[PDB]
Amino acid sequence: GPPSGKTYMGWWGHMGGPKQKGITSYAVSPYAQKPLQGIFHNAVFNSFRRFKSQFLYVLIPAGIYWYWWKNGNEYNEFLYSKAGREELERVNV
Amino acid sequence: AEVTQLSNGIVVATEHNPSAHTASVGVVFGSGAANENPYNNGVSNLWKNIFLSKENSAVAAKEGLALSSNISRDFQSYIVSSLPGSTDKSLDFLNQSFIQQKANLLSSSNFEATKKSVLKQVQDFEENDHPNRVLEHLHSTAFQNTPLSLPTRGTLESLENLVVADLESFANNHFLNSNAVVVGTGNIKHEDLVNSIESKNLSLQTGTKPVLKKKAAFLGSEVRLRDDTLPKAWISLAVEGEPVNSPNYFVAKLAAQIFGSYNAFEPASRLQGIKLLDNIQEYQLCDNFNHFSLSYKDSGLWGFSTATRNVTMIDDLIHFTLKQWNRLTISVTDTEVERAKSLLKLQLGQLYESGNPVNDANLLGAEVLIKGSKLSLGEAFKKIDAITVKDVKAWAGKRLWDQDIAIAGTGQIEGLLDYMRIRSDMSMMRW
């Protein structure tokens, strides 16, 4: 077939990034190291570190919307009691 | 065609050849680059060049004497050559300038001039000689944290902090009569060399070289040195092999000869009886390769090296080559074994029967330092003709099938895939 409109990604050998010079990589085989090595020093170090960072962005929103659902559910149950029948006929009109 | 060894406290080996026109005499020591540490690495390469400097080669040239030297991982050499009726002058020069007096050679001016040239040699090697620096990097990842990892030329950083004291310390610890062999090749008779030595007394030092704390150990790993501006990719790959003085020494050499060596631009090299060539030539995935089986005192390596300009099909080259290796365990034929027998004999028959007495001296001294004796070429041939298909399959099932590997590469190696996809190709699944 014909070639189509090209991309921002290539394939192995011509992936399409910048030319690299002066970087060296080292590695060791997995058969030569011991797995399940430190996964405490992981759930107690890193999970608690990752939690402590990204928890005020999730919980301050959650606290505003849950308080809102509360004060509404509390007020509704008052409207349909017998002590809140006068208010019901005021607000429902 | 037979060697003769005697001992007087000094070992003296000799391969006399009456039909030659020269004679070589020297001393070989049993310490190499695998007998030094990361701080003084390259002290042996600097000892070689002090021997070959000007004012020592001038003094030899006025007498009609040529000089040579070689550094390896297990041994070093310091050789003198002459015409056949001039061998007693060769021994005197080797006595005076090397074993007894060397304050002349370790002067302050000759040491700096030698260090400057050696640093320029090593810097040039690391920028321009790509197939040889990748094989040195292979040794350093395979045997990391072990004495068989250190490069023979030295490293440009460790070579800068050397002083004369490092040379003198290394000499006192390793240039010793207990660690030495005196050799003689070409047109030289054993009795004359023995007589010339006892007329003098000729001893360097007594002995007690240090023992090496750590033993060599193989570790599967990789090191990648990426350079996108070079026009090719150079790769070498190996497993753990056989040491010297092993029962499987010749069987590993025969197995490397089965896959052999290749040059794409030579017409006759394209016609070799190698089944791997039926796969590469249709898309031309490489320019050349060569299979090796290297052996040392403690360990060895077995594998191949290659260079290629087809940087988008590297994964096909590694894949097809490793699948052919699998056949040594399963389905190697009798014709492939009878071919490698007779070509291995031609190979080492040309290495041990060249015309240069300098090569003879290095080979002889290194073999006698380990075994105490040299195996003749008529004996090695009989061991090779006694190998069967069963011996090959038994060797490969133990050394190749589902075993860890070491890899090194430089250049345009984006297309070289991760470790575990290459490691998985060491077994088939379809057996």
Domain ranges of chain A: 1-93
Say whether residue B227 is in contact with chain A using an 8 A CB cutoff. Answer: yes
Residues on chain A touching B409 (C-beta within 8 angstroms): none
Per the listing, tokens 């990204």 go with A54
Say whether residue B127 is in contact with chain A using an 8 A CB cutoff. Answer: no
CA distance B152 to B136: 9
Mark yes or no for CB contact B221/A24 under 8 Å: no
What CATH class does B208-431 carry? Answer: alpha beta
Please give the residue of chain A at the shortest CA–CA distance from B315. Answer: A12
Fill in the amino acid letter for B32. G
Say whether residue B311 is in contact with chain A using an 8 A CB cutoff. Answer: yes
Provide CATH 3.30.830.10 ranges for chain B: 1-202, 208-431
Per the listing, tokens 């919307």 go with A65
CB distance B122 to B156 below 8 Å: yes
Cα B50 from chain centre: 22
Per the listing, tokens 């071919």 go with B339
Fill in the amino acid letter for B245. N
Per the listing, tokens 């021994």 go with B91
Helix ranges (H only) for B273-371 are 277-280, 314-330, 334-351, 357-371
Nearest CB among A11, A20, A29 relative to B226 is that of A20
CA distance B340 to B331: 16
Nearest Cα to Cα of residue B76 among B49, B53, B96:
B49
Mark yes or no for CB contact B224/A25 under 8 Å: yes
Q: Determination technique for this PDB entry?
A: cryo-EM
Say whether residue B412 is in contact with chain A using an 8 A CB cutoff. Answer: yes
Fill in the amino acid letter for B160. E
Per the listing, tokens 């070093």 go with B76
* CA–CA min distance B145, chain A (Å): 13
Q: Which two tokens stand for residue A4?
A: 């189509």
CA distance A39 to A41: 6
Say whether residue B141 is in contact with chain A using an 8 A CB cutoff. Answer: yes
What CATH class does B1-202 carry? Answer: alpha beta
CA distance B88 to B91: 5
Report CA dihedral (B132, B137, B142, B147) to the nearest 10 degrees. Answer: 100
| CATH superfamily of the domain spanning A1-93 | Cytochrome b-c1 complex subunit 8 (1.20.5.210)
Antiparallel, parallel or unpaired: β B300-308 and B180-186: unpaired
CA distance B406 to B118: 30
Q: How long a stretch of residues is chain A?
A: 93
Q: To which H or E segment does residue B377 belong?
A: helix B377-384
Q: Which residues contact B10 (CB under 8 A, 6 or more apart)?
A: B177, B180, B182, B197, B202, B203
Antiparallel, parallel or unpaired: β B233-240 and B406-411: antiparallel
φ/ψ of residue B234, rounded to 5: -115, 125
Mark yes or no for CB contact B223/A19 under 8 Å: no
Mark yes or no for CB contact B221/A26 under 8 Å: yes
φ/ψ of residue B83, rounded to 5: -75, 155
